[PDB]
Amino acid sequence: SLTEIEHLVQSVCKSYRETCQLRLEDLLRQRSNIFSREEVTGYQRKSMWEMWERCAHHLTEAIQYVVEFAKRLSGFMELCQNDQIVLLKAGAMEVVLVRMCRAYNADNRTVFFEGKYGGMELFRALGCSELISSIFDFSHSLSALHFSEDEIALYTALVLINAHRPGLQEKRKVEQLQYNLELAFHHHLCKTHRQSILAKLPPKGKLRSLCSQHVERLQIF
Numbered sequence: 001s002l003t004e005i006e007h008l009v010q011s012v013c014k015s016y017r018e019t020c021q022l023r024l025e026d027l028l029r030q031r032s033n034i035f036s037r038e039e040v041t042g043y044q045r046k047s048m049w050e051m052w053e054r055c056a057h058h059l060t061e062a063i064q065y066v067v068e069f070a071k072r073l074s075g076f077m078e079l080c081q082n083d084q085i086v087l088l089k090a091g092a093m094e095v096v097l098v099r100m101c102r103a104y105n106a107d108n109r110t111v112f113f114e115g116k117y118g119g120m121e122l123f124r125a126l127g128c129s130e131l132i133s134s135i136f137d138f139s140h141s142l143s144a145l146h147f148s149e150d151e152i153a154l155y156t157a158l159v160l161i162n163a164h165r166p167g168l169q170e171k172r173k174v175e176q177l178q179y180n181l182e183l184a185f186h187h188h189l190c191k192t193h194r195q196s197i198l199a200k201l202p203p204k205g206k207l208r209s210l211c212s213q214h215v216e217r218l219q220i221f
């Protein structure tokens with residue numbers, strides 16, 4: 001019914017609030033805390049290897065919270081061990097990317113990274129301009145939509161629970177789950193007068209195309 005769906009919305013948003021890693025109020029009030037021209041040089045002078053192993057640490061950490069988010073998600077636990085791993089190893093990464101836009105400031109084109117805010121010149125040492133630019137451009141486009149926490153909660157759930165991932169065994173059951181989440185998302189945008197964000201959402205395939213490029217560069221190192 002309908003009450004079930006309102007419950008599902010509430011259920012999903014609680015799970016995100018508990019597992020958002022960084023509170024929005026902390027990220028917003030620290031927007032004035034910017035790296036000095038000296039501190040950026042410090043990061044710029046580091047080696048690829050140090051810089052890669054730092055970023056890979058923050059990512060793994062972020063993925064832990066995404067995993068904890070998936071576990072609190074209604075229906076996910078009921079799935080088999082195979083489909084759980086299929087959905088996670090495909091989408092955990094994609095969720096992390098979506099989550100990142102909260103840490104992005106469009107006013108000065110900076111991102112929160114290890115305590116302070118800094119532009120993309122901070123990652124010079126990684127040696128991959130195009131990849132970093134992708135991340136910033138993607139976050140910038142998502143930041144203009146002013147995603148609420150609940151919108152992020154519901155959207156990331158749908159990113160993660162997708163019945164189009166190859167190698168699913170219990171496909172029919174993942175469809176059912178996705179379904180209810182789609183409805184929950186649409187219901188809530190209606191309740192909040194935010195139906196507008198749908199047409200402004202990233203096209204399906206974009207998220208996946210980004211991740212696939214990021215994972216390939218990463219596996220090198």
Ligand SMILES: O=S(=O)(c1ccccc1)N(CC(F)(F)F)c1ccc(C(O)(C(F)(F)F)C(F)(F)F)cc1
Pocket residue numbers: 054055056058059060062096097100111112113123131132135214215217218
């Ligand atoms: O905090 S991060 O290191 C970060 C990287 C770049 C810009 C801002 C923040 N981290 C973001 C996270 F949400 F995971 F904390 C992050 C680390 C590494 C990446 C990479 O995409 C990849 F491929 F290594 F996973 C890349 F290193 F390529 F940038 C992406 C994001």
